[PDB]
């Protein structure tokens, strides 16, 4: 194994979008090599675009990553079994495939599966086709739904055989009960059980839609279940469809570490989505709630002082928290990220902003900032010249002001005359953390 | 992938027998994806010698060849883990595995199967494990034999997915009826159906035995079903066992092109057997019958002169064939191997013996010799000292005689005084090929 | 050899900064055998960090580049094994090694040298150790300094024998007078003579220090001898040490083509320094003086429009240059980097700033900025929000102002109220490049 | 290291001339990798045939072998220093190179050396040029011979650096005294000291002559110093030249294990010489004396019975050695190989022929056979049908006779009538070793 990595990495060291690939490699250097990625795909894409999914899969595996790919044959089977016939039966709320449809789906996927594995190989990747035997599942209903079952135990045995070898495990979605009765698993129950078993770092659904949509119909650049979910279920414009995947993605992530994430995208924007700070697709985390409030008394000072000591590096001076006045407060449920407003000549003033190393990487330091600006469109703050984080402040503000030691910033459509006054004030505020 | 294929020629280009690999392999340009090779193995070898088969399979695939390997779990299943949980195997005709044994064989082979695929990768080969879903088979008997079935249709779909990628398709021996009923195919019916479907160039069973035996117990260097089979079934020393595989191998080849062949061997002699003109193991063809004749006139001279020019390397001098007298003639149907007797002072005398490089390797040069000695127990012939073949002549004869240039031989329980005369004649006979 | 060269492109073809290696390397198609790179190192690094230099050298050579490395044994010889047998080094001008120290330095470097070549091979590189016989040198002083000499003629014969084979020629720092008298060249005179002989494109000293320092003690991101040198010698904070290497590096480059450049760095920042437009270490060129002017007329417009089309990517609108008013103009001699001031309400205003990709990497875009600020302590300019350069503008300014599309900047100790006016002007100024 | 071998060997397994290359590889698998081969070369070959030596060297190294090559510049310097001048001085009995010739030979060889290393690389091999620093040597005479010295200690340090890397160490023949005085070593003293230090298995001198000559002028297919040497020094036709190399080669081998050998040949016959059982060049061993005699009483029976028990596998029946009559006896000094003649109806009869496994491989079983036939041109013997050694008997005889169990052979221009009688006798002789 330590053979392909070294160079594939001495590569990744110098690039614009490199720092965030070599490290996946090191993390899953070994053993959790498949713990890299799960990836679902609706029947359509593989059919109408056999070639793009394929071009994609071969980049992850060559980089050291390991897609463990799963596919259904929505459209090729959905339509191919009507050519044949006896296609209708969807008993409870989803598809019943009675004894007659068994041989079709085998033969179809298996056809396609290879089509995909070979499509994968065509693209320069390495992969193993693993189209039977992954899902042990119990058939739970004999009469009604016909011949459909449920994932009870997972033989990861096979995937690892492909992966260990640097192959993308291309699991199709069929299964065998443990006595052998071949069964059709609708792929979602499959993906879960699977994501469960594997604990990948990322899980993606490839569709032709290739992004998800807001009220205005634009692509959705991230969700945060932790906060967003309830609302999100509960809006009309959110069409029937969009409430359920969200149900399911919350479980998928509710059952993985948070360190996990998710996109849903079209193959073409696949590149821009995993490794950049904008992108084109939906990434979904569970992320964490933010706690708000104007009520300095509802917050844990012992604990926040405990938050602060770790982010920056100093403890607040004595008698300080008592003295703080305070306008509005944002603490994410775990007291590892927080934002605080005092006031000044009417201007909302950012007093302290502290995000622990773990929180920034989860992309949380960043949700925080967001309720803070939704609430304060006109905002002033200051900052040490070296706080290497200054750069994010310049990217976001509509104002700046630098002296040797300190730099006062502002964010709002104000003209400097106005600003100069509170700003002058801002340079004058004293240091809140002790000495240099 | 970069370093592999290349660092295989400018490697085997600095040695003596490099032309025979390029020439059997290039001639083995039956890529046809996987139409390369089928390969049975008895349960035993994988167990007691996981490592050998494995070392072997990795040479074919890196060379450009493509073993499509298949395996049962004879001993590992026969014994341990079937005897462990004390289930026990029930035989009616051959083995009945009733509903109880299903989970064991899956779980056992599947174990071992990966054991082998990983054994394969351990050895530096590329392979895919294809341990379920190749054999669609019908369970034909419900009550009696329990849960056992029969190959009706073959999804080569899988093998080609491994092979196409340069993987040794390592199909283990289980199957699914088309409705799904998991079933135990006893491997033979599997291999046939399979070899049927595939039409490989070569098909080899691997066993501990690693060779097959004659009357005297020595390894058997080739058979020729075409001629040998009838007798071969019909000899007592030929033990019960040895009659049937021959029954089956006749079918396997009877159902493949003749261009096909077959070894049965232990991993260790696998090297010497495929690509050399001696070897160590059993190669089996169907070959062709030879018809026996004294009739110079019933033979194709234009064509034999065509056979001779290729074996040795000179053409017969003018007016020769017409001149040739001829006591008796053996040509294998294809005019690529032949043996000819003239006469001399009563002694049957080998005049010419030519077997083309292809025929030698098929083990046919060698059937030819056989009717020739069944017919002439007392025999004389001669030969050049360098004809590197000489060794075989000395292994066989019961006489020799060497002078710098030529060497007269004889094969018969005669005392030199008798012999000396025809022999002296033998040295005297002139060269039949030019300078 | 098969797997190496190839598994280097379809590898660095699936990443963002792959064009800059292909483009500095292909542009670095100064194979000229070894005319690739020279590389000094102080005794220390090889000792305390045998492994780093080593990890480094193996990247150049596998890439197609060819480090011709040279080494002294500063610390290993200075201390241990010279202090061990208690000989001790005698300095008159710099170091005298009288007859007694000969065997030590041979034996020491030669040790270490292999240590490095093997360190090199450990790292997956290819190299040849070339630890005697490169420096033919004359011992000029017999009595005083003891046994020390001077490089008169260079046998590159050896280096090319290692390099031609894809070996990092690892010349250690000993020499033989032409009659044979083994001699200790203090390495500098060696490196010069050597860089002289070789004409590499780049030449780098490796030290623990791994960067060079300014007044404030920060790493120095580039010098420009052409302009900087005089001042540079002539500053007190510039400590004794820092004046001389600069003396020597001026000569080294004064004697190479300008196309040459130079880092001085610690192994760890070696990556970021050669192939990026920021980096971490000292790059030194001779660069060229800039002459200072307010005379629009003394500048080559056809040629500047030629400079501008390349940096940004649009051409100026018609009748423009004629229109341009112009307070002051900085063009580096080569018309590949330039800065221009118009005016506005009294404020010097940066109108255009264009540095071609080549100039940036030479660290020249950056000298330019320098006379521009020495001249205009109070300065205003503007900029697109995306011009990925913006960051440098924010690192420098003492003012900013952002709106969706554009961003007005300023650099001076002014209070926003003053500024707001010219700034409001700044946002108002129209685009100078088309759409 | 275990990287290049495996395949380079799975290669060598099937060939006509293969069994005798893979094993050199295994022997010198590691560590004694340079203990593979030394190789000298006269100035001429590298000049007039830069390309052949070169084509040669690259086959050994690619096969796993490791030539450690040494060269002088006989002709290119011999002639190039007369262009210059002051070329004459050969003080004792060989060449004096006074202070003036130092810079020439450096500069010449070093030129050529690289020429050879590059010639080596041109040929597809891997090599390192190691043209200074191998020979530490003392200059022993200051005034007379000018500036020439003598090999006192050997830094093998360098060779191993090339070899370890799979390079053919191409040592040129210059040296440095330990204080540094550059000196010219005439290459022979160099080769010895070197062969000494290295203990290679084979050592070869490449010349344009490319073989050595007998009385009749034909190429000499092997010598055996052990026996041949005294005579060999002592024959007139043996010209002045041919007595001395033989002096030197005896020392070279007298100071290496016997397991060693030697050819002297032209590059073109280099292929046929190391790996076949004829060849074209001279191979030289020390080999071992053969002891002869008709005197059964001068031989060690306890010991021969000790020889016999190991070769075949049986001990002679009781009272046997006493009974043996005996015509002529050949024992090589070490009692590990022997040949014995009794008589029968006048015909010299080979009674026992036993060569221990070690002796056959030294090629000694084979010298033995040779005095035995020089002495008995008409010879009869017999042999078991399976004694796998039968084949050598057929290659050599001018007669045969096979029955199921035994086979009677003869060697001589006799007609079978004559022979049949002693032969009939031969089949009738009883087994000398006990039962099957």
Residue numbers in the entry:
A (entry chain A), D (entry chain A): 5 to 440
B (entry chain X), C (entry chain X): 5 to 439
Q: What wording appears in the published article?
A:
However, in Xanthomonas campestris and some other bacteria, these reactions are catalyzed by a single bifunctional N-acetylglutamate synthase/kinase (NAGS/K), which has been proposed to have evolved from the fusion of ancestral NAGK and N-acetyltransferase. We have now succeeded in solving the structures of two NAGS/K enzymes, from Maricaulus maris (mmNAGS/K) and X. campestris (xcNAGS/K) that have substantially higher sequence similarity to vertebrate NAGS. Each mmNAGS/K subunit has two domains, the AAK domain (residues 1–290) and the NAT domain (residues 292–441) connected by a hinge residue, Gly291.
As noted in Methods, crystals of mmNAGS/K were obtained in trigonal space group P3121, hexagonal space group P6222 and orthorhombic space group P212121. Cell parameters for the trigonal crystal form of mmNAGS/K are a = b = 95.1, c = 253.0 Å and β = 120°, consistent with two subunits per asymmetric unit and 42% solvent content. Even though this crystal form diffracts to only 4.3 Å resolution, the structural solution in space group P3121 could be found by molecular replacement using the A–X dimer of the P212121 crystal form as the search model. Packing analysis indicates that the 2-fold symmetry axis of the molecular tetramer is aligned with the 2-fold crystallographic axis perpendicular to the plane of the tetramer ring. The tetrameric structures of the other two crystal forms (space groups: P6222 and P3121) are similar.
